[PDB]
Amino acid sequence: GMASMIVVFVGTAGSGKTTLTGEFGRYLEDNYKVAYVNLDTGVKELPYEPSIDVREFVTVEEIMREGYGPNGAIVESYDRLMEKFNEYLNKILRLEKENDYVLIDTPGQMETFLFHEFGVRLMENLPYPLVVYISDPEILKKPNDYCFVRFFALLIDLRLGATTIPALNKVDLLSEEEKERHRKYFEDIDYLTARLKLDPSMQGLMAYKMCSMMTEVLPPVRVLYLSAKTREGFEDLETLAYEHYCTC
Amino acid sequence: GMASMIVVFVGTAGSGKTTLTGEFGRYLEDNYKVAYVNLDTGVKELPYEPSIDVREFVTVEEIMREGYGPNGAIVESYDRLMEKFNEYLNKILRLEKENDYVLIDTPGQMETFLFHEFGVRLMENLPYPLVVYISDPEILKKPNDYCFVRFFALLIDLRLGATTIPALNKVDLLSEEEKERHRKYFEDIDYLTARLKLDPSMQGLMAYKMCSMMTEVLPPVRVLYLSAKTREGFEDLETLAYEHYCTC
């Protein structure tokens, strides 16, 4: 096709970002032409058929043989990928010319995407990509967690300089009590800050201070609730992907 | 001894956080009793003698044999450590009773510290620890990078709820032109925002918006410049460690 949208999935190893990428692809493949990009050198298996698969060129496992530990082997795998930076960039630019959606799967170690050259430069060089930042529901246990997760999404937005949508994955595992509780904090402006008042701790009152982002000029975003299992929230995301490539 | 200070070193694999921890220890061992804690399951070698070494119990390498990839093996190593959570916590609390300094080395994959239970809970349960967030100078190439790095330090502060000092490591590798350029953006309030005005990009004007943190109530912090090689900035940090355990 040619709608030419790129959607970048960001999340820590465990959040189910790779399963989501696949299933969100399948959902789209009814009405669109879709390409998948894997930028992770240490993922074991892919539930989709990749156009680009940086494991073709280098894997964390193989370079651990050379005698690196895994910390070193991960950093080293992305130093070797930079040897092919322009090649991967043009490869992705071309996928985007021949497709309606290019879905990009990033390293399970998101700092390997946030910090290293390869991930940041690739992102400064793609046309207006949208980023979906996936969070595990289990990380959400206290009102601190909510602004934390929300602030992190803001940080990705800088580092990659691309609009970043906060999402919770695996929502099908929520009991509905749980579902109700997470919705409360996220959607309701005030209520969040309200619950951020009862903690009598500086690092807690410190955390209350951070509840800053106000109205307009600094526009809070809509959080997605997603499930690969039930396809919950997929239509929202598709919509978000259209509202973005238009307005922006 | 018994000054009972804990200093927590946070930084991505590559930033030289582990070499710094060792050398900062040696510098202290002249005037203080010092204990080292390693919480990293995938670091190859330690330049110090650890009191606690979570590799004793589990390593990323060994569990990769069981057939996990490295993403999975890293997450899995910290799930197994939680089986010993209370034991490691009391072990560290006791080190702090018998020492002037307990220096804590965290996982080379800082999200394994920022996100996973083990790292966040350990930190909510330690007495007033100070966090030093180490950044590679090479990440600093454009005025965006400066607020990025500075904002990330703010995020660690929430997630662990402990005061977090931004630092640049490996300053001995700076040409002095470089040294001068990094100092400019960091110390000078305004100047930073000033240079954050010439970019004609929403995600750039977006980045200008984020330059928010104002005066008092929301007090900007002093950035450290550190070098294991020359011991630059070690006295500053020692001072910071005293000014913190006092006031705070």
Q: List the domains of chain B with CATH numbers.
A: 5-248 (3.40.50.300)
The contacts of residue A160 (CB under 8 Å, 6+ apart) are A8, A114, A119, A120, A123, A124, A131
| Phi and psi angles of residue A129, each rounded to the nearest 5 degrees, phi first | -70, 155
Residue A152 to residue B155, Cβ atoms within 8 A: yes
Distance separating alpha carbons of residues A22 and A234, to the nearest angstrom: 12
B115-B120-B122 Cα angle (round to 5): 145
The kind and range of the H/E element at A156 are helix A143-156
Resolution in angstroms for this experimental structure?
2.2
Identify the residue among B8, B158, B164 best suited for mutation to test binding to A, counting A beta carbons within 10 A and taking the highest.
Answer: B158
CA of B213 to nearest chain A CA: how many angstroms apart? 9
Identify the residue among B115, B199, B206, B248 best suited for mutation to test binding to A, counting A beta carbons within 10 A and taking the highest.
Answer: B115
Nearest CA in chain B to A107: B71
CA of B209 to nearest chain A CA: how many angstroms apart? 7
Count CA atoms within 13 Å of residue B241 on its CB side: 23
Q: A17-28 vs A234-247: helix axis angle to the nearest 10?
A: 80
Positive or negative, the Cα torsion across A190, A191, A197, A203?
A: negative
Kindly list the residues from chain B whose CB atom is less than 8 angstroms away from the CB atom of residue A203.
157, 161-163
Taking the CB of residue A218, how many other CB atoms lie within 10 A of it?
Answer: 13
Kindly list the residues from chain A whose CB atom is less than 8 angstroms away from the CB atom of residue B210.
154, 158
* Residue B165 identity: I
Beta strand pairing call for B5-10 and B101-105: parallel
Identify the residue among B111, B113, B136, B169 best suited for mutation to test binding to A, counting A beta carbons within 10 A and taking the highest.
Answer: B111
Method: X-ray
CA of A212 to nearest chain B CA: how many angstroms apart? 9
Kindly list the residues from chain B whose CB atom is less than 8 angstroms away from the CB atom of residue A159.
144, 148
Distance separating alpha carbons of residues B107 and B247, to the nearest angstrom: 29
How many Å from the N-terminal Cα to the C-terminal Cα in chain A? 21
Alpha-carbon radius of gyration of chain B? 19
